[PDB]
Each structure stands twice: as structure tokens, then as C-alpha cells.
Amino acid sequence: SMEMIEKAPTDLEDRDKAPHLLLLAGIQGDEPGGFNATNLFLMHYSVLKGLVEVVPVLNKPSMLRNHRGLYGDMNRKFAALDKKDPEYPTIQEIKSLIAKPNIDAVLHLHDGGGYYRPVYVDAMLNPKRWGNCFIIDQDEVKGAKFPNLLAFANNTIESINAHLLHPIEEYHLKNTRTAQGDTEMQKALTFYAINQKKSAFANEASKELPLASRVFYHLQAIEGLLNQLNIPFKRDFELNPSSVHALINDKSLWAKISSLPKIPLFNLRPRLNHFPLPHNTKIPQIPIESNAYIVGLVKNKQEVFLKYGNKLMTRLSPFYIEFDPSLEEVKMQIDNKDQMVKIGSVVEVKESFYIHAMDNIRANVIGFSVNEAGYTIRFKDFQKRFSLDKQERIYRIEFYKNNAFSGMILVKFV
Numbered sequence: 314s315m316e317m318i319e320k321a322p323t324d325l326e327d328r329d330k331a332p333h334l335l336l337l338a339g340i341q342g343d344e345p346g347g348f349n350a351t352n353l354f355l356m357h358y359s360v361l362k363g364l365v366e367v368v369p370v371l372n373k374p375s376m377l378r379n380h381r382g383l384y385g386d387m388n389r390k391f392a393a394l395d396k397k398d399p400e401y402p403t404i405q406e407i408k409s410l411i412a413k414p415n416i417d418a419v420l421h422l423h424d425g426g427g428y429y430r431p432v433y434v435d436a437m438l439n440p441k442r443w444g445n446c447f448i449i450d451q452d453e454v455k456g457a458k459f460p461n462l463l464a465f466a467n468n469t470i471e472s473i474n475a476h477l478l479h480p481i482e483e484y485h486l487k488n489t490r491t492a493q494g495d496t497e498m499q500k501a502l503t504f505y506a507i508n509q510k511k512s513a514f515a516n517e518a519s520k521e522l523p524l525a526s527r528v529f530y531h532l533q534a535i536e537g538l539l540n541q542l543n544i545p546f547k548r549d550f551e552l553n554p555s556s557v558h559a560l561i562n563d564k565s566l567w568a569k570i571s572s573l574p575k576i577p578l579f580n581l582r583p584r585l586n587h588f589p590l591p592h593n594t595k596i597p598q599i600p601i602e603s604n605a606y607i608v609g610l611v612k613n614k615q616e617v618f619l620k621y622g623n624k625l626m627t628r629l630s631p632f633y634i635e636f637d638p639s640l641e642e643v644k645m646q647i648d649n650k651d652q653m654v655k656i657g658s659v660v661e662v663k664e665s666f667y668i669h670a671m672d673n674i675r676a677n678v679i680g681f682s683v684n685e686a687g688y689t690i691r692f693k694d695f696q697k698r699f700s701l702d703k704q705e706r707i708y709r710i711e712f713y714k715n716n717a718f719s720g721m722i723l724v725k726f727v
């Protein structure tokens with residue numbers, strides 16, 4: 314289930330004041346440098362004129378299973394393709410984005426093995442390898458707004474190479490001269506783009522690099538190309554591997570599953586038991602929201618995994634149950650003060666809480682034992698192993714009516 318997100322200026326008229334870039338990653342589901350780079354771009358950059366359309370992950374089902382491509386190589390499906398291929402509709406969506414008049418340029422991100430060199434050096438460094446290179450299908454595309462691919466590529470490479478972490482990481486140009494007999498690249502995404510008279514580029518980050526360094530180079534390539542296109546932008550951080558690592562591992566990231574409260578992505582216990590999910594609903598249909606763009610759910614054996622790209626954030630052991638939406642709010646005393654707490658919220662507790670009883674609603678405070686409404690509850694009353702978090706501060710309160718699920722509230726002890 315890929316999606317397209319627009320990064321555009323605040324003033325809608327400014328969209329036509331600079332070029333339009335389509336930024337794509339994750340066509341292989343095991344190349345996280347690309348789709349963590351698109352994720353950070355969406356979360357932390359602003360486009361001040363023009364437009365950058367972003368598909369953060371093209372092959373989302375494969376990403377969720379940490380798999381190169383569950384239905385084969387999606388980047389060989391842009392030429393001949395049987396209408397019955399399982400990804401045929403996804404390919405049509407991708408082609409439609411690429412071919413729209415409102416796109417000038419396309420940048421396709423990949424992670425690749427070893428380090429490309431134009432001459433054979435050794436097993437890791439040679440023309441067959443793909444890491445740390447910037448790729449075009451040909452030097453010029455007649456009829457594009459910016460036909461000079463080579464000039465753009467050379468300048469983008471120069472920009473990246475001004476920021477090398479180690480000298481082995483030096484970027485080189487790879488021109489696949491696709492039209493001149495490269496039957497594999499003839500089936501891939503950027504050649505389709507060139508044939509729609511878009512300027513098209515791919516960036517490769519080496520798989521020999523740690524994720525933060527891969528993402529660093531992908532972001533250098535994006536910035537280099539935006540600079541060549543004269544698409545002005547800002548970002549809310551300094552571009553170095555330390556900062557990239559911090560932003561990937563951002564403790565403010567959350568996931569909201571169905572009508573449940575937001576849970577933090579990071580520092581969840583590895584397994585969460587008896588976790589309510591709506592029954593008779595296929596997992597890909599369960600709404601899941603996040604401030605990140607590469608989060609989802611996927612079935613694995615008898616568990617449901619919460620994924621952040623290729624990272625496993627927790628294993629849900631599901632409790633499939635009817636989600637009754639009639640209960641909107643619950644009266645709770647929080648640190649002596651009565652308040653109406655909405656179902657699906659998180660309430661911070663310094664001292665204590667007390668849930669007011671409701672006639673046909675039963676409350677289970679998970680980790681508290683004696684209906685558990687009508688008890689004054691403090692941190693020392695909790696069995697800490699029932700916490701959602703490694704920090705042992707976040708606990709679930711679940712409401713039932715009374716063979717159906719009426720909702721959840723989280724308490725966080727602060």
C-alpha cells in the first residue's frame with residue numbers, strides 16, 4: 314500500500330515558481346537507506362517554492378516483511394507486464410505519477426552492494442557493484458524541461474563528494490546507456506521516466522554502510538539535485554550521521570492503531586500480550602497512523618508485528634474482539650482532580666488516579682489486581698512487567714461492555 318505525499322510551499326501560487334521533483338524509494342523492501350531517507354525528508358524538510366512529490370516506500374508489503382520483493386523484482390515491471398501480475402495495479406499507479414505533466418524530474422533511491430568503480434579493482438570495488446554511485450540511463454533527454462542529465466549528474470556528484478565521511482565512499486557516475494542494449498535497465502523505473510521526457514536519476518547508497526550513513530548519502534543526493542533544479546528548501550537539523558541517527562531513532566515517534574491511544578515506537582517491550590484488535594478485519598485494513606511515513610502492521614505466524622521500516626518495534630499477541638465505539642470518555646480523578654478523559658488518550662500521572670464506576674462498563678487496569686473502577690491507584694500498586702514500555706512507566710486501562718471492547722486509555726507515570 315504505497316502512498317504519495319506532497320511537500321509544497323505554504324502559498325499555493327509558489328508551486329509554479331520552481332521545478333517539480335518526484336522522489337521515490339523502497340522499490341526493494343530490504344533497502345532501508347532509501348525509505349528512511351524519504352521518511353526523514355517528509356518529516357524534517359520544507360519545500361519553499363516548486364514541489365517535491367514523495368512516495369516514501371514503493372513496495373510496502375515487501376518492506377513490512379524485510380523482503381527484497383515478495384512478488385519478484387518490482388523494478389523489472391515497467392515494460393512488458395502481464396495484467397494478472399499481483400503488482401500490476403501498483404505499477405500503473407507509479408507510472409501515472411511519473412508521467413504526469415506536473416513532474417519535471419524523478420529521483421529513485423536504492424541501497425546497493427559493495428562500491429561501484431568504473432574499473433575492476435576487487436570483489437567489493439568494481440563495475441558490477443552498485444554502492445555509492447549516481448546513475449543515469451543516458452546523457453541527454455530531448456524534450457525534457459532539463460534535458461542535460463549528464464551535467465545535472467556530474468554536479469550532484471560533486472556536491473555529494475564535498476561531504477565524504479571516508480574516502481572509499483566517493484561517488485562516481487554510472488551511465489547505463491540503457492537504450493543501447495541493457496535489457497534489464499530497459500525494464501526499470503528510470504527508463505520509463507526518460508521515455509515520458511522526464512529527467513530521471515537514481516542514487517545508490519552502499520549496503521556496506523550503516524543505516525545512518527546510507528541515509529546521510531541519500532540526503533546529500535537529494536539536496537544536491539534540489540540545488541541543481543533550483544528548488545529551494547530548508548531542514549530543521551544539521552546533516553551529519555549523528556543527527557540522522559538521532560532522527561531515525563526519534564523517541565517522539567508514535568503509532569496509533571485503530572482507535573487505541575498513541576504508543577511510542579521506541580522502547581516498547583518486545584512483546585505485548587492480549588492486545589485488543591478489531592475482529593473480522595484483515596490486518597492491512599486496520600488503520601494505523603504515525604508521525605513517520607514507513608510504519609505498519611503485518612501478520613507473522615500468531616503475532617502481529619509493528620514495523621518501522623525494517624525495524625521490529627514490538628510483537629503484538631492479538632486479542633480479536635468487537636470494538637464498540639459508544640464510550641467516548643471516562644471520568645477519572647488524576648492527582649486529586651476530576652477530569653473527563655477521552656477514550657484513546659494518554660494521561661500523565663504524578664501521584665495517583667481513580668476511575669469512576671459506570672453502570673455497564675467494566676475497567677481492567679492492566680498490571681493492577683485486587684471491575685477495577687473505584688480503586689485509588691498509585692505506581693507502587695502496579696506489577697511492572699505489565700507495562701507497555703521498557704521504562705515501566707506506561708500502563709493500559711481497558712474498558713469492556715462487557716463482551717465487547719469499549720476502548721483503552723494509557724496512564725504514563727511522570
Ligand SMILES: CC(=O)N[C@@H](C)C(=O)N[C@H](CCC(=O)N[C@@H](CCC[C@@H](N)C(=O)O)C(=O)O)C(=O)O
Nearest residue numbers: 388421423424425426443448498501502503504515
Ligand atoms: C537484479 C540483480 O542484478 N541483483 C543482484 C545480483 C545485483 O547484481 N545487485 C544488487 C541489486 C542491484 C540493483 O538492483 N540495481 C538497480 C539499479 C536501477 C537504476 C535505475 N535504472 C532505476 O530504475 O532506478 C536495479 O538493477 O534495478 C545489489 O546491489 O544489491
Ligand code: NA
Nearest residue numbers: 480481482483
Ligand atoms: Na577509493
Ligand code: NA
Nearest residue numbers: 595596597598
Ligand atoms: Na489482506
Ligand SMILES: [Zn+2]
Nearest residue numbers: 341344423424
Ligand atoms: Zn535497489
